[PDB]
Design a protein around this ligand. Structure first.
Ligand SMILES: Nc1nc2c(ncn2[C@H]2C[C@H](O)[C@@H](COP(=O)(O)NP(=O)(O)OP(=O)(O)O)O2)c(=O)[nH]1
Ligand SMILES: [Mn+2]
Ligand SMILES: [Mn+2]
Length: 539
DNA sequence: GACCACGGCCAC
DNA sequence: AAACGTGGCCGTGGTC
């Protein structure tokens, strides 16, 4: 391109280089812009930011986040990554999108800006006529990128002193468990090395190996295997306890306090918008979509996510979301009636499984029931279901028979979906988001049936992700007007932060927006709570 | 120091 | 482990 002096004209495509992938932590090393066969390279990138009216180009959200960090309202606009991702969600990285649609991802801002210009022109051309993907682009993904930029720049408050103290309490229990393990094994070794554990459990001790690992064929030490040996030998029980605590300490308790940002005082994740095959978001650096919740220690970790002084967290989570979606997608009159009758299939499976009244279904029982309901739904084998439910193969098999018999329109939908996937090569959501599933016609059964399970899961999970994204796009302006903040999305949940005097109003409003986002054949229902911390707000 | 594969496991 | 699906991060073990 012909080098032109900064600033660029309105509507130019930007390119930028970060010192590191995380925008909230990155030094802006270079800034450039391309338009009309000219490239503009900034002499000092931080100052040059002030000249742009929007971030338009590859990874626009990231630059917008860094501008917000610097106090600049630079919203993300067009991003060829989002076009590629809607065309095919295996388009996940600039490296790949460039290597597919006519360019090369380098480490120079001017080139990245020129690349952004050429990739947009191309991908926008490929989407000419794809009016459903163009709707999703204009009405969901492009506006959503602005929402995520704000969430990423806002962050969440963390009770650091609390987690530091918890680290010590957990450490003392870890050393106790290790001591009991070393004693049972008769000698010390590295519990964290599954190779060494394998030799202790299955060679030194006489324990039987239930299963083997995929790539290398070692005898597995997975929880599922160890659960199979739970009473086979006590050491197993302590191993499982040691695993839980080191997992939570090494992944959450210890890393998270060290990630608080100097200027904000808060913790900042990244919401990756072109990372999943189904249309879901993902979260990284750190992942705040897999913060513990299930166990008593996990609940203690979640209590560390707290509201700024004078504010409250509002947590909203859709009810039985993919089951309602399935009702709408399949048109099963029976499943639809379940939700018009306001029943709850998780608590009912729970009461089935645990032989207890729906009044006696604690959160652990529901989460166990969730896994059964979605496991069975998405093709789980009777054999595993017997293992999980600790119940004979004949029973587990009739569980699956009952499940499907209750909702016959479902299996008709599954086979319609798969037939469509074979014919067109892709499956699609309610709003037309696509996943290409080429292995539906594979000649190896195992490969083909795996593709089948991925293929007919995507319309259900991807529709739910579509609804949530749309809700976020609708809800966000309403929150800014009430002086509230959107902090986190966890697939079918949102965490907000609101002034204490507005929290009831924000909660009421957010629940209405989310439930009425896009009426289906069944009502969407949202559970909402309010609390000083993430855990209190979900109750 | 940078990467990577693997097994393993947290969440939805 | 396994004919549930979708992610990202851990420590180990390893290379360059
Ligand atoms: N295939 C599969 N999908 C799952 C699993 N866990 C979650 N999902 C998918 C399917 C779920 O619909 C969705 C949201 O997960 P939740 O909010 O934790 N559960 P839900 O909204 O259903 O019930 P309620 O909110 O009343 O507790 O994530 C799983 O083990 N397997
Ligand atoms: Mn839910
Ligand atoms: Mn949820």
């Amino acid at each position: 391109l012909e080098e032109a002096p900064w600033p660029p004209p309105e509507g130019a495509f930007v390119g930028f280089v970060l010192s590191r992938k995380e925008p909230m932590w990155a030094d802006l090393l270079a800034l450039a812009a391309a338009r009309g066969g000219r490239v503009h390279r900034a002499p000092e990138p931080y100052k040059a930011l002030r000249d742009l009216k929007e971030a338009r180009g590859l990874l626009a959200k990231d630059l917008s986040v860094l501008a917000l960090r610097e106090g600049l309202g630079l919203p993300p606009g067009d991003d060829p990554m989002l076009l590629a991702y809607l065309l095919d969600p295996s388009n996940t990285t600039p490296e790949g999108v460039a290597r597919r649609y006519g360019g090369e991802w380098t480490e120079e801002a001017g080139e990245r800006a020129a690349l952004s210009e050429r990739l947009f022109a191309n991908l926008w051309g490929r989407l000419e006529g794809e009016e459903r993907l163009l709707w999703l682009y204009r009405e969901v993904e492009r506006p959503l990128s602005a929402v995520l930029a704000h969430m990423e720049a806002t962050g969440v408050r963390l009770d650091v002193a609390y987690l530091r103290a918890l680290s010590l309490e957990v450490a003392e229990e870890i050393a106790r468990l290790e001591a009991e393990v070393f004693r049972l094994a008769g000698h010390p070794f590295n519990l964290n090395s599954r190779d060494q554990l394998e030799r202790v459990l299955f060679d030194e001790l006489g324990l039987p190996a239930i299963g083997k690992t995929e790539k290398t064929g070692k005898r597995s030490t997975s929880a599922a295997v160890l659960e199979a040996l739970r009473e086979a030998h006590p050491i197993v029980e302590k191993i499982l306890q040691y695993r839980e605590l080191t997992k939570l300490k090494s992944t959450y308790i210890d890393p998270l306090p060290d990630l608080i940002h100097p200027r904000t005082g808060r913790l900042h994740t990244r919401f990756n918008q072109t990372a999943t095959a189904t249309g879901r978001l993902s979260s990284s650096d750190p992942n705040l979509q897999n913060i513990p919740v299930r166990t008593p220690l996990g609940q203690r970790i979640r209590r560390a996510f707290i509201a700024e002084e004078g504010w409250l967290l509002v947590a909203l989570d859709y009810s039985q979301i993919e089951l309602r979606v399935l009702a709408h997608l399949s048109g099963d009159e029976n499943l639809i009636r379940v939700f018009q009758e306001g029943r709850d299939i998780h608590t009912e499976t729970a009461s089935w499984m645990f032989g207890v009244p729906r009044e006696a279904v604690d959160p652990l029982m529901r989460r166990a029931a969730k896994t059964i309901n979605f496991g069975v739904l998405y093709g789980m084998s009777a054999h595993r279901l017997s293992q999980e439910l600790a119940i004979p193969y004949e029973e587990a098999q009739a569980f699956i028979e009952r499940y499907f018999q209750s909702f016959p329109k479902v299996r008709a939908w599954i086979e319609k979906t798969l037939e469509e996937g074979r014919r067109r090569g892709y499956v699609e959501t309610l709003f037309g988001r696509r996943r290409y599933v080429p292995d539906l016609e594979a000649r190896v059964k195992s490969v083909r049936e795996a593709a089948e399970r991925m293929a007919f899961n995507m319309p259900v999970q991807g529709t739910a992700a579509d609804l949530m994204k749309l809700a976020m796009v609708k809800l966000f302006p309403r929150l800014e007007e009430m002086g509230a903040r959107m902090l986190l999305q966890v697939h079918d949940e949102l965490v907000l932060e609101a002034p204490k005097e507005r929290a009831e109003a924000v909660a009421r409003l957010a629940k209405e927006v989310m439930e009425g986002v896009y009426p289906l054949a069944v009502p969407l229902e949202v559970e909402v709570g309010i609390g000083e911390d993430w855990l209190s707000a979900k109750e």
